[PDB]
């Protein structure tokens, strides 16, 4: 069971933390006494998040601005963040490329850009982070969506990127389990959350209820700190069970017995 | 009920058709009397396939050699294949990057190349083909894997790209259904198949049973000509129900109430 | 889509109609202009229901009083009710034995009596009605419970009888589909309803929320009239899917091919 | 991990033990050194089983002949068998009424008689055994079928009675767990088994393969000894997953939390 003391003095990176859920994550970490380093494109927005973190009582707080479209930035961001904190205990991968809802009709560049920003960068970050995470037996939060488990019309590029995160990171978890690598990987599956981006983008099109971002952010922390495989925050107590896919869990357990683990 | 006459005089691209399942797909289409354009990188191997297709009874058979890592090739390949046949009725997307079963050790370049060859090129080919396929009320076969519905240790880059196909193409199918677009999309879910690539790549590592490549190829063709949403060929009548994800089907169905469709 | 016009002039039996859901079912049918014959053991209560049905607009309304513990009453009841209305279109089997919530302690006599009242009478009633129902291509509603799909502490005798109802009536439906017998059978799965009996019986014991009896009654009517296999009224949009058991549906589908239907 | 010495000197009742699975269960217990009392109606068949059990190594073997249609016999049988062995460690409820396959067309007596033999007698036997089983912290095997979890055409009376067993005994188990009563209850879910009765009844109607009775009997004994909630013996490795019903397990878990257990 979660205690906020579990983040006291912990060294945590938060991406996409200028606004929305990621900003709320940073705020909760600050109140728990964590060291944070926040990132996003907007310097202006990030300065303001850092000031507020300090006031809430973070152990320390710093920002680094850049685009996660740029793989070299992602790699160098992590090195400098670990240098600022003297290590890393938790990597929270929360950023995402904004894409307007439309029926797909040939926007290949957006398919490319969505995969770069929402997927390849997450992998780059995690690779860059992995030595420090192994040293501290730390944790990664991979922030995804109900739309990275099922499909929804009007968001094909985004959903493909989120499916990919499941395929990659769940594979990596399985490998870490067999190899006795004590770095936890928590895939966070979120429903509609009441950030600004969401409410505007869905206005007039998607009518589901939205859940509060402040709560959403807290549950992401809690699940990742408890080293959960998955964390569901989706507006219903029943939906996590419909998304949990027990058939997949069965097939994975049985298929594992087919490997020659000695070789 | 499938009849081989359904492919007589039809115009069919097969990618990854120099060997393995792809080659088998090409032979079957030839026996059914289709027009075919095959592709892969190896010009020598494609020629062998084309001569064999002519002998087997193909209406027409041509090849174009190139790499699906190059999105410009992919775009040009379709327009040329379409000029060679005078149109396009079916696009079989079967190619995949050769990989080996090894734990992920941070090989970022391979994640990137896998995603290009296995995923982004499928999208690029589909978009190039879409005009011709709307004209013919045609079909797309998307060749995937059980590893694009559940994860397996030692293949994280491949599984990520395959999961990505499901999120992308399944979303597209749903948009095509609401918009009454007469282009079907069949996600092919394959278990282990006795291609030379799979036998050698699993030897001493993964010891599950394999199914026969010739029948595998015929089942892709059949399920695609019959315009099925999904086609499972996995060595079991039971397993397709544990991969079909009843929970996801329920959520997607219920999701229709959540859109303002008139808008 | 349901229209109340579908029950106008229809000939309907309602059992356990002196209070609770059964009473409400009677009222709703009256408003739609059905003919109703109602039953239970309390004469005075039944006389009040009949009068109110007439006031509300029933084409006709009669009661016959007796105990469904008595299999000869059940049979004779059906014959008299069809005689009163000149036929039968719908059999609503709603009565149940009162049972308090305690741990089972060897009360064998109660296991017996619960099976007589809740199960055997329902079979006997159905058997008596069947000729009339085949003549009208009519319908049976079998009123059951979430406790006829899963188990709950403190109601073992009751649950046993509700489970029997599913095994029996669901087999009968399967036999009727196969034999082109056009009598529909609707298993109604009710969550907690705010009848006086349920409120009293669960008070300080079972604290889950209760749905309104008036709507519950209407939903039984609509689902049965629409000829659904099953009708869930459990106060959740999602729970019906955790109850209706996709695994069972798959198995029943696959097993049907194991029969030698020609024979 | 089961070991056969687990049953050496244990005291076991086997009903329906004159032929079929019940006979094979008696024989396996004998081999393991158990004390057995066997019952069915056929005196002469039970004599043969007893002599053979003694040959195989049974610590002791007795029979009592009688019909489980007779509830008084059932009650007295248990007291007498416990007298004969000086206690009871395991009650294996295996008997069933044979019912010809037929479309249901109003055989109300068969519905009654099947519920008496197949269900009521199991309850009465369990209640009569309960003091001895509480004293030995013993076990009950409730032998059911795939057709006590899903429905099959032509066997409605049988299926109703097996469904009832699940509702009753699974409720009692959940009460025993809460009341810390150490008597285990194992529901045995069997596929088609090659007893002479099954093979003759299904000949030319139901074409599914039948599994061996000898192994079926051993698995019942093993799962019951291991104090499992359910034991599946069915034909396919996948079927226990499909019949396992995770939705029911979830709902039972979450419902249980709605009780005021203090009260
Ligand atoms: N809101 C929802 O309903 C919902 C539902 C399901 C899942 N989620 C998920 O939750 C996470 C957060 O969503 P949100 O609604 O809080 O999003 P948001 O309010 O749009 O915030 C996005 C954050 O990511 C950053 N970002 C965007 N493009 C970037 C780029 N190229 N490089 C670096 N940073 C970039 C932003 O800052 P800059 O613009 O300054 O870079 C911003 O800080 C996402 O992973 C998302 O898919 C959200
Ligand atoms: N075999 C299995 O057990 C199995 C299981 C599940 C799913 N699948 C799937 O079924 C499909 C067929 O697999 P397979 O075993 O038949 O594969 P395979 O025998 O290795 O054949 C792969 C084909 O793809 C082509 N290819 C590889 N790299 C390419 C590139 N960069 N650009 C263009 N073409 C390239 C190949 O020719 P070049 O090398 O000459 O380009 C070859 O024709 C794949 O999508 C795969 O994911 C296979
Ligand atoms: N209320 C709930 O929360 C709930 C939950 C799940 C399912 N259900 C189901 O819905 C149905 C009705 O529930 P309810 O709450 O409305 O029950 P109720 O208020 O107790 O009414 C039961 C009716 O059945 C009759 N009945 C009882 N014993 C009888 C007997 N021996 N012979 C003939 N009739 C008898 C009663 O009248 P007399 O006493 O005049 O005979 C009464 O009309 C039952 O099938 C039940 O299992 C209810
Ligand atoms: N065989 C299958 O495919 C199959 C499949 C699923 C489940 N099962 C289950 O496995 C269990 C055994 O099946 P089986 O195939 O072995 O049955 P079986 O060969 O027909 O034997 C039934 C036993 O129960 C007895 N019995 C029948 N009527 C009785 C009565 N009125 N009172 C006392 N005993 C009576 C019989 O002896 P007397 O006639 O001498 O009384 C016989 O000993 C049954 O519970 C059944 O539901 C069997
Ligand atoms: C409609 C599908 N929604 C419903 C539940 C989750 C999924 C989603 O990720 N939406 C997108 C969309 C609206 C929100 C803000 C951005 C644009 C990012 C997502 C959430
Ligand atoms: C072990 C996972 N197998 C079980 C069947 C699905 C899956 C897989 O896609 N294998 C891949 C892997 C091994 C073989 C050669 C290539 C890489 C392509 C597939 C077959
Ligand atoms: C707590 C189990 N409830 C939860 C929801 C449905 C199941 C039920 O069948 N209750 C019956 C039982 C006890 C109560 C009074 C009557 C007989 C009617 C129901 C409520
Ligand atoms: C058709 C459903 N079968 C198929 C698998 C198990 C189930 C069953 O229990 N059948 C009955 C039926 C045939 C056999 C002998 C009796 C009559 C007892 C059962 C097995």
CA torsion sign for C157, C162, C165, C171 is negative
Q: Which of residues 179-238 of A touch C (CB under 8 A)?
A: 236, 238
What is the token pair recorded at A52? 């507020």
Nearest to C92 by CA among C209, C244, C216: C216
What are the angstrom distances between the C-alpha of A211 and each of A122, A214, A235, B76? 25, 9, 6, 46
> DSSP assignment, residue B19?
S
Nearest to C27 by CA among C1, C61, C3: C61
Nearest to A140 by CA among A153, A155, A124: A124
What is the token pair recorded at B123? 């999208």
Atom of ligand 5 nearest to the CA of A190: 6
Output the CA angle B111-B112-B118, nearest 5 degrees: 85
Q: Cβ contacts of residue D223 below 8 Å, gap of 6+?
A: D141, D186, D188, D230, D231
Which of B153, B161, B165 has the CB atom closest to A174's CB atom?
A: B153
Residues of chain A with Cβ-Cβ distance to D253 below 8 Å are none
CA distance D94 to D117: 11
- Coil, strand, or helix at residue B190? strand
A14: Cα separation from own chain's centroid = 9
Q: Is there an atom of ligand 5 within 6 Å of A192 CB?
A: yes
Greatest CA separation for chain A: 57
**Interface contact B242-D239, CB threshold 8 A:** no
Q: Cβ contacts of residue C229 below 8 Å, gap of 6+?
A: C173, C185, C186, C187
- As beta bridge partners, residue B233 has B190
Mutate to test the interface with A, among B167, B170, B191, B255 (most CBs of A within 10 A): B167
Q: Cβ contacts of residue B203 below 8 Å, gap of 6+?
A: none
Cα of D229 to ligand 8 centre, how many Å? 22
Which of B241, B247, B250 has the CB atom closest to C250's CB atom?
A: B241
Nearest to C231 by CA among C242, C220, C241: C220
Where is the binding site, in residues of C?
16-42, 67-68, 94-98, 145, 158-162, 193-197
CA distance D106 to C123: 9
Q: Residue A246: closest CA among chain D residues belongs to which residue?
A: D246
Mutate to test the interface with A, among C191, C234, C237, C238 (most CBs of A within 10 A): C238
Structural contact between residues A66 and A39, judged by C-beta atoms closer than 8 angstroms: yes
The secondary structure of C188-244, three-state, reads EEECCECCHHHHHHHCCCECCCCECHHHHHHHHHHHHHCCCCEEEECCCCCHHHHHC
**Interface contact B242-D238, CB threshold 8 A:** yes
Greatest CA separation for chain B: 57
The total domain count for chain D is 1
> DSSP assignment, residue C4?
G
**Residue C158 bears catalytic tag:** yes
What are the angstrom distances between the C-alpha of B41 and each of B51, B156, C56, C113? 17, 24, 79, 77
For residue D251, how many C-alpha atoms fall within 13 Å in the half-sphere facing its CB? Answer: 23
Q: Is there an atom of ligand 4 within 6 Å of D49 CB?
A: no
Structural contact between residues C110 and C153, judged by C-beta atoms closer than 8 angstroms: no
**Interface contact A247-D241, CB threshold 8 A:** yes
Neighbours of C51 (CB within 10 A): 12
CA distance A238 to D49: 52
A250 touches chain D (CB under 8 A): yes
* Count of all residues that appear for chain A in the document: 263
The β-bridge relationship of strands D139-145 and D184-190 is parallel
Catalytic residue among A158, A233, A241, A259: A158
B171 touches chain A (CB under 8 A): yes
What is the token pair recorded at D238? 């996948």
Cα of D204 to ligand 4 centre, how many Å? 21
Q: How big is the B-C interface in CB pairs under 8 Å?
A: 6
CA distance B214 to B195: 10
Structural contact between residues A117 and A157, judged by C-beta atoms closer than 8 angstroms: no
Inter-helix orientation angle D213-225/D20-31, to 10°: 60
3-state helix, strand, coil in chain A (%, to 5): 50, 15, 30
The rounded radius of gyration (Å) of the Cα atoms in chain B is 18
Preceding-residue numbers of gaps in chain D (C–N over 2.5 Å): none
Atom of ligand 4 nearest to the CA of D97: 28
**Across chain B, where does the E strand assignment appear?**
11-14, 35-40, 60-65, 90-93, 139-145, 184-190, 230-233
CA distance C235 to A239: 15
CA distance C126 to D260: 39
CA distance A260 to B154: 12
Q: Is A3 annotated as a binding residue?
A: no
Expressed as residue numbers, the domain containing B199 is 1-263
Which of B208, B239, B259 has the CB atom closest to A206's CB atom?
A: B259
CA distance D89 to D136: 6
Q: Give me the resolution in angstroms, 1 decimal.
A: 1.8
Q: Is there an atom of ligand 5 within 6 Å of A201 CB?
A: yes
What is the token pair recorded at D79? 């007291």
- Coil, strand, or helix at residue D140? strand
What is the token pair recorded at A133? 């995470």
Q: Is D26 annotated as a binding residue?
A: yes
What is the token pair recorded at C233? 């009224």
Ligand nearest to the CA of A121: 1
The CATH number assigned to the domain holding D56 equals 3.40.50.720
* Ligand 8 pocket residues where CB is under 6 Å: D 145-147, 152, 155, 191-192, 197-198, 201-202, 206
Q: Residue D237: closest CA among chain B residues belongs to which residue?
A: B238
**Interface contact D247-A241, CB threshold 8 A:** yes
The β-bridge relationship of strands A60-65 and A35-40 is parallel
D134 touches chain C (CB under 8 A): no
> DSSP assignment, residue A92?
E
Q: Is A69 annotated as a binding residue?
A: no
Output the CA angle C134-C140-C143, nearest 5 degrees: 165
Q: Is D129 annotated as a binding residue?
A: no
């Amino acid at each position: 069971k979660f205690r906020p003391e579990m983040l006291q003095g912990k060294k945590v990176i938060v991406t996409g933390a200028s606004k929305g859920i990621g900003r709320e994550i940073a705020y909760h970490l600050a109140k728990m006494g964590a060291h944070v380093v926040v990132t996003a494109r907007s310097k202006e927005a990030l300065q303001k998040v850092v000031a507020r973190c300090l006031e809430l009582g973070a152990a320390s707080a710093h920002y680094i601005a850049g685009s996660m479209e740029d793989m070299t930035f992602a790699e160098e961001f992590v090195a400098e963040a670990g240098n600022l904190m003297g290590g890393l205990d938790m990597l929270i991968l929360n950023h995402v490329l904004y894409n307007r809802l439309t029926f797909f009709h040939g926007e290949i560049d957006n398919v490319r850009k969505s995969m770069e920003v929402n997927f390849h960068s997450f992998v780059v970050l995690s690779v860059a982070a992995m030595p420090m995470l192994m040293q501290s037996q730390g944790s990664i939060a991979v922030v995804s969506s109900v739309a990275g488990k099922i499909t929804y019309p009007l968001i094909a590029p985004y959903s493909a990127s989120k499916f990919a995160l499941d395929g990659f990171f769940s594979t990596l978890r399985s490998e870490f389990l067999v190899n006795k690598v004590n770095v936890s990987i928590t895939l966070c599956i979120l429903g509609l959350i009441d950030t600004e981006t969401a409410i505007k983008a869905t206005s007039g099109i998607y009518l589901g209820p939205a859940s509060p971002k402040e709560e959403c952010a807290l549950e992401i922390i809690k699940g990742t700190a408890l080293r959960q495989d998955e964390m569901y925050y989706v507006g219903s107590r029943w939906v996590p069970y419909l998304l949990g896919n027990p058939g997949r869990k069965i097939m994975e357990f049985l298929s594992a017995a087919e490997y020659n683990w000695d070789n």
